[PDB]
Amino acid sequence: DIVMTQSPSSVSASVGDRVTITCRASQGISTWLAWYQQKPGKAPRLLIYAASSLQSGVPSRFSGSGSGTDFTLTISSLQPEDFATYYCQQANSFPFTFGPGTKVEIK
Amino acid sequence: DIVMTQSPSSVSASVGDRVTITCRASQGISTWLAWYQQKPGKAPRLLIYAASSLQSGVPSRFSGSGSGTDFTLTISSLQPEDFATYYCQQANSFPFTFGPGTKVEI
Amino acid sequence: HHGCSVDFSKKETRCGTGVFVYNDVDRYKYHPDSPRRLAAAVKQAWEDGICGISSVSRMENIMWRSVEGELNAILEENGVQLTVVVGSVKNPMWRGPQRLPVPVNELPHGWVRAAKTNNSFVVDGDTLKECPLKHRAWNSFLVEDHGFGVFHTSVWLKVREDYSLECDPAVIGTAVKGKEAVHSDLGYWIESEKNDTWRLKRAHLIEMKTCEWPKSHTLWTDGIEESDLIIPKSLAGPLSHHNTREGYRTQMKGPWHSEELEIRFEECPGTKVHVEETCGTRGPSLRSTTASGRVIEEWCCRECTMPPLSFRAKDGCWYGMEIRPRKEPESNLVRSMVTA
Amino acid sequence: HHGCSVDFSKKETRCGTGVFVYNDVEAWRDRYKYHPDSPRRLAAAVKQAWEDGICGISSVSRMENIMWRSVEGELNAILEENGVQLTVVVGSVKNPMWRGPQRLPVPVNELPHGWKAWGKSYFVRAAKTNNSFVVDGDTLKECPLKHRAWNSFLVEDHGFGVFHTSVWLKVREDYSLECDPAVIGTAVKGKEAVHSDLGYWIESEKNDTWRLKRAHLIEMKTCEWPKSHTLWTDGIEESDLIIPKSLAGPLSHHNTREGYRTQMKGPWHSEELEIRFEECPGTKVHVEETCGTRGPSLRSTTASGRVIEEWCCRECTMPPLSFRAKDGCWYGMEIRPRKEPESNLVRSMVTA
Amino acid sequence: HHGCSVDFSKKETRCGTGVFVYNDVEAWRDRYKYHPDSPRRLAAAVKQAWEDGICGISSVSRMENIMWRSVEGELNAILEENGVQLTVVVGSVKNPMWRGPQRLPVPVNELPHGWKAWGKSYFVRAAKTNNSFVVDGDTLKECPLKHRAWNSFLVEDHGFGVFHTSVWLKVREDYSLECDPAVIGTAVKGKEAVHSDLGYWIESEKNDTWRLKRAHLIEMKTCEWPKSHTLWTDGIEESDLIIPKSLAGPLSHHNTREGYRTQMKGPWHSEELEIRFEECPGTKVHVEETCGTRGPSLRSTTASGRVIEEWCCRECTMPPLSFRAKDGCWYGMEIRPRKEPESNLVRSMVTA
Amino acid sequence: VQLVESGGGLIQPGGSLRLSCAASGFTISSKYMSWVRQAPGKGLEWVSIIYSSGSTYYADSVKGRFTISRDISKNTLYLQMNSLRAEDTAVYYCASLGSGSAFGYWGQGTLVTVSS
Amino acid sequence: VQLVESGGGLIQPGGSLRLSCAASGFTISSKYMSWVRQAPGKGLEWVSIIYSSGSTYYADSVKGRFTISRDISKNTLYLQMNSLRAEDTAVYYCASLGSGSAFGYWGQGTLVTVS
């Protein structure tokens, strides 16, 4: 029973822009949060684990930072490949719970 | 999932008549059958257990018998207080299952 | 609690304090509640409609066989026409629906043999006709507070006052240490091991019971179905993940009519088992040697796992329920006529 | 194994074969020979871990801390013999021992220099380096916990109980959350049960119901007690365990007491405590419906040494739940002082 | 006492009453409660000793060092409550443990302040002072060994072997040189004998003659083994004992080996050694009349780790005498190198 | 002996409820307590049981949603009902297993209505 | 590595259905394998996990109705679903815990419709 919340609901951005997405938790987890990217019609893909680490095989332009209850996801140089939906899920205790999801559009 | 089937669905007999009720199991359930009587608006009352043994305090005019898959509950002398619904249930394994029920009227 | 042990594989010795579970699968002289309360209980039971006693284990059978003479002596010198005759025990030991009543008071007179009477209170034996199982008591004793121990040699039981379906927990001991485990009591010895997952390794039984193994004395009781337990729950098998083996289901139709069984996962001598997609389905267990002494040699199973399951009876070497012959028809082999 | 047991009232014995679970707690673990997988192999593993981004190690228990202490010298020697600028520094253990997200890799190829055993006598103490691989200590400032590896070793064989045997370990390939089951011993016999490992000794009893009797912990580890080594695992709520599931407490009805709930905010900062059910010297507990609600655990004596006398609980059961550490009596979360305000009393500052 | 013994070939036991001597060496001494006579009495004794001119303590064994560590906090607190400007500082032990000429006095009256039992939990820590009463440490400069007290305690009651018993001690009224006999156990049975205490375990056997078989010493104490606790004390010279008399070696024929004299210049600086009659790894010894005369003991490997291959003795007997420390194998005084000159080797610089 | 079960009322579907059963004349730690329900116009159906030793079993209908418990201090039997659905409405009884394996002593019932 | 799902499809309410997730490139018994579902038009939801030792845990939505299994001889994951309701329509994935406690390898996903 840990509710994960996200803001905003959708982001419109142009290529080469800087994008920032945040996660919010009902309780204190403080390290155990991971970020996923899902394109439509395909399974989600892990980008960041332990709230700051970079999963092998993803470009370095994705950064994660935060602890406690507030977490953020940033993208440095947006690419045409980076238009999808993103989720945050707490990995602290069972049951594992995901967020609502924030989707990045073309502006 | 031992399905317990009862027959007949209803009998109408007058005072002084013998009444016979049959119960049937979908499997073996050796000798582990109980019979209950439930007047409207009250809890059921145990009459027979182990398919032949009579519960303390119950009148002796009730009698039951059977083994294997076929069972029988019989009353000798209907009384004005013997009109109710009667249930059979197996006590062999979990879950415990009851029967549809049979009403004795007039 | 204080003791020493040795590991002959590494040849190392140590000492200390702890909990020790011993293999006991004779030395006990049993003492029921009294010679003057048991007689009153039997008297009340006979006058209540209970015609006999069905034993739970071999412990109770030995107790009754030892105490019958004295019990008859008191019950006869006190003026009651009743004699207790105790027979042998046949497997499996089925349940009874009745229970012995606890007397309010003892028999007034009591602390030389007696004569046979026309009234019989038959304890477990070959007397299913003058006392059917529907009128027999079962599971009516409890070993007393400190009635059992490692150093006891004399077990003190008392007549139970409630209705239970579980085995007595005072004689059960289970333990796990690393990659080995055991569930045991005075009649069972069930072993497990960790190869890739936990599984049954071997089991030695000198009696087949029908009480229920308590969950308080069982390891890993959750997330397990009764259809996977090799020793069925109806035969006092533990509801445990240590009671499973991959590719096999519950052995409802094993040779439970036997007198002392031994489960191990190894082929019977002079036999071969091959995993075949065109083998017959499962049913009653078969014996490798025909009644004429001929040994069957070729067997198959649908999707079982090698090595195969076998039961080492005193009179043969049976196979599991999934293992079937290829060439010889099974209408001529020997099968088990009991089910759990 | 084969063993014998002894009765001292009547001097004699009982012998046989079976399973024997010994009380191995409060015994010095540093009198063994530790053999992690291999010096060349482990040096390559540490090198690859440093190249990947892992800063150091968070120890699961005290046995790994002692292992790293025994190994660090030869490990640094082997690293220096290969021209790698890396030194392994081993610190101290403080409770609770929290978890790290990283794991230690398994190298494909070991380093091609050095000896092929542990215990090579005589080697040149190595030289210090500007790059440090820190095993857990008072160093959560140069690298955080999120970059530390945790629970990355598997015991292959051991001889605990004999004070000069060898312990063989190995770097695993998988991500796991459970404690190592090679050193766990659980046993029940009649009306008494034990759940034990190298650092825990938890006792149970059969009163009207099965319940906790007493526990003795010399460490506070945060792995998970495996379910294959637990009695009566089903039908038990996680909210009723006296020792929390986050502190490697077994998930069983043997870990329960009537009237108490999970002790999330007990004095887990202690180096060693001992859980027992009775009042503390010069204190009395009364069941009162007007007592305050449960909160963090409190110490019986004040910071000035003054003993508080009168306590209360809403619906607990006598005897009360107390923790006996080196400082002194603490009380369970359900027991609060009847008169003196709680701002005059010291409290636990940790939660599981 | 009453006890039982076990044979594991045939699993059974033999029980009876008698005298039982246990191997208590290499067991952790940190798990007991210590009661030097009284807090006020001990404080008055230490105060009077400081006023007389005694500066500190030289420890007889490691048990006394651990006792002082357990006591120092309460002792400093109770000294402070009486307005005495004196603090007790406890250091570490190094071998050999030399003896001092002073003794600790027995005061007429205790200090008239403070509590009356050891273990009073919660005390305000005392503050440091200019005057320091140093129990043995690396501090032989503010006051030398000729001003230190030694062997001033007697054990009255103990429970060694049971890890929560109390040890009762008192300050003796006399000057003495023998070791405390309350913790000594000697026993022979057939062809095997033992001379033991809390830090010594000396084994003997019956070959053609009685001789030393092996020894295990975790400390180098310089008291004297009592003759009441020694077997075969007559007809033996002090120049034939393998372990010197000045190192608390028994004055026994069981402390001898044919062809060897007393080892006054062995490696007595080590923290722990184990005496064997067996060649060091990769070494051979030859009996030749051309070898040199006995001198200080030499290490088998050189300072750079190179193993010497050939040694000689004049009239010694095989197998040769060796010592086993952390560094490695040492040789007896009678065994000298065959070819390589002794200037290349590490030699013992300690004499008994 | 007396059995009196108390806490049955009306509840919205998807909600939760808790029934109690107080025992008189005996202690609950010595008998096999069970819960049985009778739908209006239908027959009986067994829900769950608790052993004297503390082991609990359930029917497939209510396997993961209901839970049975007891308190020896108050000598009371409980039944926690979670995530109620439409077909859970019935009169709930409190029975003990005496001999054979039949229920000898019953309660009076308590009506639970699940509707919106 | 590779994970391949299996036969989800059409089923009436109150019916039963069994999924599969065949593993390639690794042993199924050396990972923590989970089931995650996504309702059509909604977000992700975790269902059940099985440990590398055999320990299983579930969510309160499917506590007494689903069962996660595993067969080592054929190297595949299993999910038995019973008493399916209308709110069980989703796409089911099989995943693995790698590090942190995040799911590293995902399957393609299989559709289940209950009506």
Residue by residue, DSSP assigns C269-283 as TT-EEEE-TT-----
Across the interface, whether the CB atoms of C173 and D165 are under 8 A apart is answered: no
Asked if D146 and D100 touch (Cβ cutoff 8 Å), the reply is yes
For residue D267, cis peptide bond before it (omega within 30 degrees of 0)? no
Q: Indicate the pairing of strand A19-25 with strand A70-75.
A: antiparallel
Nearest to D228 by CA among D170, D177, D185, D190: D185
Element (H or E) spanning D70, and its range? helix D62-81
Q: How far apart are CA E200 and CA E247, in angstroms?
A: 11
Across the interface, whether the CB atoms of D234 and C215 are under 8 A apart is answered: yes
SS3 per residue for F25-47: CCCHHHCEEEEEEECCCCCEEEE
Question: What number of helices (H) and strands (E) belong to chain D?
Answer: 2, 20
Q: How far apart are CA E288 and CA D106, in angstroms?
A: 55
Burial of D233: CB neighbours in 10 Å, binned 0-12, 13-18, 19+? buried
Question: Do the chains A and E touch each other, judged by at least 3 C-beta pairs below 8 angstroms?
Answer: no
Whether A101 and chain G come into contact, CB under 8 Å, resolves to yes
A and G: number of Cβ contacts within 8 A: 54
Chains that touch D (3 or more CB pairs under 8 A): A, C, E, F, G
Across the interface, whether the CB atoms of A101 and G43 are under 8 A apart is answered: yes
Element (H or E) spanning B1, and its range? none
Across the interface, whether the CB atoms of C134 and B49 are under 8 A apart is answered: no
Question: Do the chains E and F touch each other, judged by at least 3 C-beta pairs below 8 angstroms?
Answer: no
The chain B residue lying nearest C136, using CA atoms, is: B50
Q: Indicate the pairing of strand E166-171 with strand E33-36.
A: parallel
The residue of C98, C128, C134 whose CB has the most chain B CBs within 10 angstroms, and thus the best one to mutate to test that interface, is C134
Alpha carbon A85 to its chain centroid, in Å, reads 9
Method: cryo-EM
Element (H or E) spanning D150, and its range? strand D148-150
**C77 by DSSP, 3-state: which?**
helix
Q: How many CB atoms lie within 10 A of CB D295?
A: 12
Asked if D40 and D114 touch (Cβ cutoff 8 Å), the reply is yes
- List chain F residues with CB under 8 Å of D209: 29, 54, 72
Q: How far apart are CA G29 and CA G44, in angstroms?
A: 25
**D40 by DSSP, 3-state: which?**
helix
Chains that touch E (3 or more CB pairs under 8 A): C, D
Supply φ then ψ for residue E88, to 5 degrees. -105, 125
Q: What share of chain E is helix, strand, coil (3-state, %, to 5)?
A: 15, 30, 60
Nearest to A70 by CA among A19, A8, A28, A18: A28
Q: Indicate the pairing of strand D192-196 with strand D185-189.
A: antiparallel
Nearest to C86 by CA among C146, C127, C119, C116: C127
Q: How far apart are CA B36 and CA B49, in angstroms?
A: 9
Alpha carbon C72 to its chain centroid, in Å, reads 28
Tallying the residues shown for chain F, one arrives at 116
Element (H or E) spanning D192, and its range? strand D192-196
Asked if A37 and A47 touch (Cβ cutoff 8 Å), the reply is yes
Written as one letter, the residue type at C212 is: E
Q: Which two tokens stand for residue D134?
A: 């820190």
Q: How far apart are CA G5 and CA G17, in angstroms?
A: 14
**D146 by DSSP, 3-state: which?**
helix
Asked if D132 and D181 touch (Cβ cutoff 8 Å), the reply is no
Longest distance between any two alpha carbons in chain F, whole Å: 42
Alpha carbon D227 to its chain centroid, in Å, reads 17
Residue E60 CB-half CA count within 13 A: 24
Q: How far apart are CA A39 and CA A84, in angstroms?
A: 5
Across the interface, whether the CB atoms of B44 and F44 are under 8 A apart is answered: yes
Asked if D35 and D167 touch (Cβ cutoff 8 Å), the reply is yes
Whether D53 and chain A come into contact, CB under 8 Å, resolves to yes
Chains that touch B (3 or more CB pairs under 8 A): C, F
Across the interface, whether the CB atoms of D229 and C219 are under 8 A apart is answered: yes
Q: Which two tokens stand for residue D246?
A: 């986050």
Nearest to C302 by CA among C330, C323, C325, C284: C323
Element (H or E) spanning E299, and its range? none
Task: Determine the straight-line distance between the first and last CA of chain C, rounded to whole angstroms.
Answer: 39
C149 contact partners, CB below 8 Å, separation of at least 6: none
- List chain F residues with CB under 8 Å of G63: 64-65
Whether A40 and chain G come into contact, CB under 8 Å, resolves to no
Asked if B3 and B23 touch (Cβ cutoff 8 Å), the reply is no
Residue C124 CB-half CA count within 13 A: 24
Q: Which two tokens stand for residue G3?
A: 């994970």
Written as one letter, the residue type at E67 is: M
Q: Which two tokens stand for residue D98?
A: 């929290």
Q: How far apart are CA D55 and CA E41, in angstroms?
A: 54
Beta-strand ranges (E) seen in chain C are 2-7, 12-22, 52-53, 83-86, 120-123, 136-137, 141-143, 157-159, 173-177, 180-184, 188-194, 198-205, 261-264, 272-275, 298-301, 310-311, 318-319, 323-325
Rounded to the nearest 10 degrees, how much is the dihedral formed by the CA atoms of G99, G100, G102, G105?
-10
Written as one letter, the residue type at G19 is: L
**E310 by DSSP, 3-state: which?**
strand
Alpha carbon D351 to its chain centroid, in Å, reads 16
Beta-strand ranges (E) seen in E18-90 are 33-36, 56-57, 87-90
b/e sequence C190-219, b meaning 16+ C-beta within 10 Å: bbbebeeebbbbebbbbbbbbbbbbbbbbb
Question: Do the chains A and B touch each other, judged by at least 3 C-beta pairs below 8 angstroms?
Answer: no
Asked if B70 and B60 touch (Cβ cutoff 8 Å), the reply is no
Asked if E275 and E329 touch (Cβ cutoff 8 Å), the reply is no
Asked if F47 and F57 touch (Cβ cutoff 8 Å), the reply is no
Q: Which two tokens stand for residue E160?
A: 């060694």
**E253 by DSSP, 3-state: which?**
helix
Supply φ then ψ for residue C49, to 5 degrees. 120, 5
Cα of D350 to nearest chain G Cα, Å: 23
Supply φ then ψ for residue E188, to 5 degrees. -125, 145
C50 contact partners, CB below 8 Å, separation of at least 6: C98, C100, C135, C136, C137
Nearest to B73 by CA among B85, B2, B81, B28: B85
- List chain C residues with CB under 8 Å of E6: 4
Asked if D326 and D269 touch (Cβ cutoff 8 Å), the reply is no
Nearest to E184 by CA among E290, E334, E63: E63
Q: Which two tokens stand for residue D143?
A: 């690298």
Cα of D146 to nearest chain A Cα, Å: 6
Among chain C, residues having any CB pair with chain G shorter than 8 Å are: 196-198, 223, 241, 246-247, 305
- List chain C residues with CB under 8 Å of B31: 97, 133-134
Beta bridge partners of E214: E203
Across the interface, whether the CB atoms of G53 and D177 are under 8 A apart is answered: no
Q: Indicate the pairing of strand D153-157 with strand C173-177.
A: unpaired
Burial of A84: CB neighbours in 10 Å, binned 0-12, 13-18, 19+? middle
G103 contact partners, CB below 8 Å, separation of at least 6: A36, A46, G34, G36, G95, G96, G97
Q: Would you give the DSSP letter of residue C63?
A: H
Nearest to C184 by CA among C316, C22, C7: C22
Across the interface, whether the CB atoms of C16 and D161 are under 8 A apart is answered: yes
Supply φ then ψ for residue C117, to 5 degrees. -120, 170
Which own/partner contact pairs does B67-72 have at CB distance under 8 Å and 24+ positions apart? B67/B30, B67/B31, B68/B28, B68/B29, B68/B30, B69/B24, B69/B25, B69/B27, B69/B28, B69/B29, B70/B22, B70/B24, B71/B22, B71/B23, B71/B24, B71/B25, B71/B33, B72/B20, B72/B21, B72/B22, B72/B23
Q: Would you give the DSSP letter of residue E247?
A: G
The chain E residue lying nearest D306, using CA atoms, is: E122
Beta-strand ranges (E) seen in D67-131 are 87-90
Q: Which of G30, G55, G100 has its CB closest to that of D174? A: G30
Q: How far apart are CA D17 and CA C334, in angstroms?
A: 37
Chains that touch G (3 or more CB pairs under 8 A): A, C, D, F
Q: How far apart are CA G54 and CA G64, in angstroms?
A: 18
Q: How far apart are CA C242 and CA C222, in angstroms?
A: 12
Rg value, chain E, Cα: 23
Q: Would you give the DSSP letter of residue E102?
A: B
Q: How far apart are CA D344 and CA C31, in angstroms?
A: 61
Q: Is the dihedral of CA C321, C327, C332, C334 positive or negative?
A: negative
Q: How far apart are CA D320 and CA D336, in angstroms?
A: 11
Supply φ then ψ for residue E337, to 5 degrees. -65, 155
Q: How far apart are CA D95 and CA D273, in angstroms?
A: 11
Across the interface, whether the CB atoms of B98 and F45 are under 8 A apart is answered: yes
Beta-strand ranges (E) seen in chain G are 2-4, 10-11, 17-24, 33-38, 44-50, 56-58, 66-71, 76-81, 90-99, 102-106, 110-114
Supply φ then ψ for residue D11, to 5 degrees. -60, 100
Q: Which of residues 4-23 of E touch C (CB under 8 A)?
A: 6, 8
Q: How far apart are CA D71 and CA D64, in angstroms?
A: 10
Burial of B93: CB neighbours in 10 Å, binned 0-12, 13-18, 19+? middle
Task: Determine the straight-line distance between the first and last CA of chain G, rounded to whole angstroms.
Answer: 35
Q: Which two tokens stand for residue G39?
A: 């309702």
DSSP per-residue letters across chain F: -EEEE----EE-TT--EEEEEEEESS-GGGSEEEEEEE-TTS-EEEEEEE-SSS-EEE-GGGTTT-EEEEETTTTEEEEEE-S--GGG-EEEEEEEEEETTEEEE-----EEEE--
Q: Which of D102, D175, D227 has its CB closest to that of G55? A: D227
Which own/partner contact pairs does G51-58 have at CB distance under 8 Å and 24+ positions apart? G51/D176, G51/D177, G51/D178, G52/D174, G52/D176, G53/C197, G53/D178, G53/D181, G53/D226, G53/D227, G53/D228, G54/C197, G54/C198, G54/C241, G54/D227, G54/D228, G55/C223, G55/D178, G55/D226, G55/D227, G55/D228, G56/C223, G57/A94, G57/A95
- List chain A residues with CB under 8 Å of G93: 43
Asked if C132 and B53 touch (Cβ cutoff 8 Å), the reply is no
Q: How many CB atoms lie within 10 A of CB E98?
A: 15
Edge-first strand listing for the sheet containing C52-53:
C83-86, C120-123, C52-53, C136-137
Element (H or E) spanning C207, and its range? none
Asked if B97 and B90 touch (Cβ cutoff 8 Å), the reply is yes
Q: How far apart are CA C243 and CA C208, in angstroms?
A: 16
The residue of D191, D207, D208, D318 whose CB has the most chain F CBs within 10 angstroms, and thus the best one to mutate to test that interface, is D208
Across the interface, whether the CB atoms of A53 and D146 are under 8 A apart is answered: yes
Asked if F48 and F56 touch (Cβ cutoff 8 Å), the reply is yes
Beta bridge partners of G19: G79
Whether F70 and chain C come into contact, CB under 8 Å, resolves to no
b/e sequence A15-30, b meaning 16+ C-beta within 10 Å: eeeebebbbebeeebb
Q: How far apart are CA A57 and CA A50, in angstroms?
A: 16
Written as one letter, the residue type at C262 is: E
Written as one letter, the residue type at D283 is: T
Question: Do the chains E and D touch each other, judged by at least 3 C-beta pairs below 8 angstroms?
Answer: yes
Asked if C298 and C325 touch (Cβ cutoff 8 Å), the reply is yes
Q: Which of C13, C175, C242 has its CB closest to that of D187? A: C175
Q: How far apart are CA C208 and CA C260, in angstroms?
A: 8
DSSP per-residue letters across C246-257: TT----TTS-TT
Nearest to G55 by CA among E8, D55, D178, F6: D178
A57 contact partners, CB below 8 Å, separation of at least 6: none
Question: Do the chains G and A touch each other, judged by at least 3 C-beta pairs below 8 angstroms?
Answer: yes
- List chain E residues with CB under 8 Å of C4: 6
Q: Which of C49, C134, C234 has its CB closest to that of B31? A: C134
Asked if C99 and C36 touch (Cβ cutoff 8 Å), the reply is no
Asked if E5 and E16 touch (Cβ cutoff 8 Å), the reply is no
Q: Which of residues 22-81 of D touch C (CB under 8 A)?
A: 22-24
D234 contact partners, CB below 8 Å, separation of at least 6: C215, C221, C222, C223
C47 contact partners, CB below 8 Å, separation of at least 6: none
The chain E residue lying nearest C2, using CA atoms, is: E4
The residue of B1, B29, B46, B53 whose CB has the most chain C CBs within 10 angstroms, and thus the best one to mutate to test that interface, is B53
Written as one letter, the residue type at D185 is: G
Across the interface, whether the CB atoms of D146 and A49 are under 8 A apart is answered: no
Asked if C75 and C67 touch (Cβ cutoff 8 Å), the reply is no
